Design a protein around this ligand. Sequence first.
Ligand code: FES
Ligand SMILES: [K+]
Ligand SMILES: [Mg+2]
Ligand SMILES: [Mg+2]
Ligand SMILES: [Mg+2]
Ligand SMILES: [Mg+2]
Ligand SMILES: [Mg+2]
Lengths: 98, 133, 86, 96, 137
Amino acid sequence: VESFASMLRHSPLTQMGPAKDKLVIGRIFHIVENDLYIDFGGKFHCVCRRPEVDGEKYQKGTRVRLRLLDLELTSRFLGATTDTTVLEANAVLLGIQE
Amino acid sequence: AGSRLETVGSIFSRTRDLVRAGVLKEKPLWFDVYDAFPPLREPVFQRPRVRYGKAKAPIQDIWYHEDRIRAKFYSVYGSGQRAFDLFNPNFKSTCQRFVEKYTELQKLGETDEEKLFVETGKALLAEGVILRR
Amino acid sequence: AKHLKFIARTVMVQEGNVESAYRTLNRILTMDGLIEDIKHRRYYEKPCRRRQRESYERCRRIYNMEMARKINFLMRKNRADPWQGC
Amino acid sequence: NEDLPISMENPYKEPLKKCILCGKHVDYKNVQLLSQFVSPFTGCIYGRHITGLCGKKQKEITKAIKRAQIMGFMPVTYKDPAYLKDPKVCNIRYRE
Amino acid sequence: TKFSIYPPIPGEESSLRWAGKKFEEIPIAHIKASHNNTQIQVVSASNEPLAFASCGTEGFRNAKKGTGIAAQTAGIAAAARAKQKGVIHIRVVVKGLGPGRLSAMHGLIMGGLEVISITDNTPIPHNGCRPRKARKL
RNA sequence: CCCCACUAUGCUUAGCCCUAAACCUCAACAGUUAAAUCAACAAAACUGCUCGCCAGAACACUACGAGCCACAGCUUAAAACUCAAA
Ligand code: FES
Ligand SMILES: [K+]
Ligand SMILES: [Mg+2]
Ligand SMILES: [Mg+2]
Ligand SMILES: [Mg+2]
Ligand SMILES: [Mg+2]
Ligand SMILES: [Mg+2]
């Protein structure tokens, strides 16, 4: 039987290592006007702006290329014992996956 | 009705004491189920504490041997132009294949970190995977 | 006094735009702290008052930058509601 | 279990950031270098928020500038015009 | 050729000329903008006084001296008395932060002189003499 | 109080005087972050050990005594009468 330790060791997310400046594949699952919510396999989705080039091609279920900057955007502020989280990842939308 | 002192004991202890004391005529519907199958921890209120001095959280950082190799790879050949597909449970990145080849060479040869890296690069190029330093 | 003249705090006029040269010189003198130094040197500031003022400005700047950082960090969430109704 | 994590220093730890003058010697006779951290119009020494230098090298530059100024190597009230066309390393713009 | 705000260096040769003369040969208008009075003196490159005008020499009295109009009038008078000696181009050297700092140059321009550069030489001690005490008004 | 002028004084040398909201208003060393953390506020809560100090207010940064390069001075520092508060 495969233990949880083996699963974590051989998980693609674990294998990726640091998430900064890593190219990943995400899928559009929600659209709000020009805001595209993309899941790329992480804990949180990322919200991207619809590109001005071939914007019509970006629809729900579309596969897109992303450059990950942070898996979760957090920041400790003055006079706070715990970090404040926006519950979103940071990524840059590169284009559609051919 | 039961006591509303949520900070004293637990719901089970309060209900049990009130039932035995006669305040509650009948046990609630969940009392028997709780008694038969209790939780791992009794749900008792506790105030979280800020740590000071040398007190530290016991949470360890998750590291593996291959991570070293990965770091060097990500420092030498950079991030692979190929994109990661985290949805696939068995995705294999260029770095992962480099790691597997490195480990196979280590188990089938000597232990010289630079030589393993260079020969692993030669082997991957022989297989036909582009690797731009 | 012992320095060469027409090198320090000097701006050349372009195409007869004297007002632009004056405003550029004013910007330079204000940025380098000369204007506030001249204005503060008109009367003597006591050392304790000077220390209190310097501490106040330093803490004011730190607090203002931190608040700006917090507002910019939390500004990302200000978009159209994606779960309107529910 | 061989798959358990092992204790280890962070292998992905990025090298700690360096100032532009780190590892280099600051000498009071190098007026060309010291002139890169003073105002062209007033000769005032720029603060670290403008120069981007670390505290140690900021102090070194300040002491070298004062020594050169008092020993007759550097002007005080302005930057030497010969060094006005040197590379700009300070984060300050007069829109000039 | 990109315009340079930085004044020409007497040593380094430059092509900038004003009526055939170099930068270091242009007359200098020294403006002293005090809090209650403004003084303008035009001198030659060799420090020969050509013209002089203040707000007090133009009839203004007491608080009327420390106004923009008085400084403008003084600048106009200085410009006239300098034009009567062949002055066209001038380099302005301002000293002080008085109300006549800019009005004096406005008057000089309105009097017919052309300004080619503005210099500030306000006295800034590096903490020398102790200033007077603050007023308790 | 505003403006002008000008002294003692701020400066150097050789002696004194020994006071400050001389305050981080936190005594010095060593240790802990577990307990109900904890009157309140200030500055998270405590433990071991040692020195100094405090036992209602005012009289009182006072009187007297003693010491002092100080002589309208500094250190130490009470009592009587009075009150139910401070
Ligand atoms: S960062 Fe190393 S000397 Fe400045
Ligand atoms: K204090
Ligand atoms: Mg003190
Ligand atoms: Mg002690
Ligand atoms: Mg003691
Ligand atoms: Mg008492
Ligand atoms: Mg006494």
